[PDB]
Amino acid sequence: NCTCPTNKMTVCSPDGPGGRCQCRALGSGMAVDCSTLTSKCLLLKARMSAPKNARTLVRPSEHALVDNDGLYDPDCDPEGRFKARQCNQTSVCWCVNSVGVRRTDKGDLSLRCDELVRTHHILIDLRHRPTAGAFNHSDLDAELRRLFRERYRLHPKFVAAVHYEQPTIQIELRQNTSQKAAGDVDIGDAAYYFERDIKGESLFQGRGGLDLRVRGEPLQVERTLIYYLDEIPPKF
Amino acid sequence: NCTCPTNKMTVCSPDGPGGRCQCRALGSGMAVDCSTLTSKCLLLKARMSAPKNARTLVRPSEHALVDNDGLYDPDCDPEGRFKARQCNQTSVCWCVNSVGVRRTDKGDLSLRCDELVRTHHILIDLRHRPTAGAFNHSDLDAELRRLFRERYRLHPKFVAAVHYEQPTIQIELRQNTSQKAAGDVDIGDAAYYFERDIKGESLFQGRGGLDLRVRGEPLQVERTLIYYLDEIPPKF
Numbered sequence A, B: 001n002c003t004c005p006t007n008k009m010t011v012c013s014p015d016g017p018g019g020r021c022q023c024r025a026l027g028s029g030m031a032v033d034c035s036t037l038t039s040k041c042l043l044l045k046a047r048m049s050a051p052k053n054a055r056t057l058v059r060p061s062e063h064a065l066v067d068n069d070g071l072y073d074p075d076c077d078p079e080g081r082f083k084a085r086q087c088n089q090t091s092v093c094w095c096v097n098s099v100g101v102r103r104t105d106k107g108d109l110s111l112r113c114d115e116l117v118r119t120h121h122i123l124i125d126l127r128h129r130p131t132a133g134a135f136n137h138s139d140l141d142a143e144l145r146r147l148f149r150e151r152y153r154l155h156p157k158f159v160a161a162v163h164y165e166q167p168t169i170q171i172e173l174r175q176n177t178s179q180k181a182a183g184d185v186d187i188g189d190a191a192y193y194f195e196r197d198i199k200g201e202s203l204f205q206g207r208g209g210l211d212l213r214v215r216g217e218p219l220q221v222e223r224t225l226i227y228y229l230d231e232i233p234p235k236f
C-alpha cells in the first residue's frame, strides 16, 4: 500500500519498476525517506507549495499578509537542509540557521552567507489548559522523553531536560554538530514535527494531532513557544 | 532488490517503511521515477555532481576546460525540467530552452527569462562505420522506431521521420506542447538517453551501450549531431 507514514505531505503511487511504490515530496518534488523525519525545509516548501493550477481557486496577494511573518518558501540544498541564504523576495536576502529562522539583517542580492549556522539548543515552552491541579513531574518527564524517543525517533541523549511547574512546561533539546552521527534525526526536525503535532497539523499519515496523555489524564496545550539557540550569535 | 532500471545515476537502499525501497537522484537528491525516463536536467546535475568528500580525489582546476563547452551543472525546477534562467554560479546568467542548451546572449544577475521555451523538433544525425555495403531503408526505419518505442518508452507518433542515405542516417522527432499528454516522455529526455547510449555511457541499469543491430548487422556509430529546434527562435 503506497503510503509515506512519516510525511503525509507527499505524493506516492505504484508507478515503479514492477509496480514499485514511488513517492516524492509535495511542492519541492524532492525525495523523501518515509522511514524517518523529512527535513523541515522540504516540509516548509510543501506547506506553501503554490497549487499547480488553481482553476477555480484564488491566489494570495502582493499585499495580503499572514499571522506568522516567519512563514515563507525556502530553497533547500541537495541534502534536504536549508541553504545558508534565503532570498524569497525581489532583491531582499538574509542568512538563516539550520532551523530556518533569520540570523542577519535583510540585505540585497550581493549577500554572502558562508556557513549554515547550526541551531544546537532548542527550548520548547508549552502551557496547557489548567486542570484541577498539577501532574507529577516524573510522569511528565517520562511521557515527553518517550514521545521524542519513539514518535519523532529522536535519540534519548538529545533531550537535555524537562522542567515542570504550575501549567507552564519546558523542554530542552541539545545537539551539537560534533555529537550528530550518520542518520540521526535533527532536533530542528523533531521540534518542527512536535510543534506541528501540538498545533493539530501533524505530518504523520494516520494521526491528526497529538494525544499527549500523562498517566490517564490528557494534556491539551493552549500556548507554545519555541526558542532556537545557535552556536554563533546572530548579527543584528 | 533495490534497483532503478531507468536511472543508474541514483542511490537506492531498503531503508523504507517496512523495508521499502527509496531511491534519490545523484547530485541533486531529487526524487526519481524509475519506471520512466528522468528529466535531462537532473541527469545533468548528476553528471558533474562534485563528489561529496574527495578525500584522495580532487576538484578540476578553475582554469581547466572540458571537451564540451555546453556541459554545466544546471538548476532544475521542482518538476524536474530546466529552470528558464541558468547561472552556473557567477554573475553570468542566460536563458535556456526545455532541453537546456543556450538561447540568449550571456548577461548578468538582473536577467529575466519570462518563460521556459519549448524544444519541439529534434534532429539526430548519425554516421556509422562503413560496412561493405549499405542497409535497407525499411529495416533501419523499423529498428529505430522500435528502439524509440520500446526502450526509451517514447510514443510512436513523436518519431516524425527516419532518413537514410550512404552511411549518414537521420531521425526527426516532433513534439509540440499541445500534443504532450499526462505522463508522456519528452523528446528531449528520449534524445538525451539516446545520445548517452550512442556514446557508451548508458543511463540504464543493465546496459552499458547501444547494441543497435539492424537485421543482424551491428551498427557502430562514429559521429553524432543532434540539433534542437525551439518554438520561439533563440535571440542572439
Ligand SMILES: *[C@@H]1O[C@H](CO)[C@@H](O)[C@H](O)[C@H]1NC(C)=O
Pocket: A064, A072, A073, A074, A088, A089
Ligand atoms: C516571500 O515573503 C513574503 C513576505 O515578505 C511573502 O508575502 C511571500 O508569500 C513569500 N513568497 C515566497 C515564494 O516565499
Ligand SMILES: *[C@@H]1O[C@H](CO)[C@@H](O)[C@H](O)[C@H]1NC(C)=O
Pocket: B048, B066, B071, B072, B073, B088, B089, B090
Ligand atoms: C560550469 O559548471 C561546469 C560543471 O562541469 C564546470 O566544469 C565549469 O567550469 C563551470 N563554469 C563556470 C563558469 O562556472
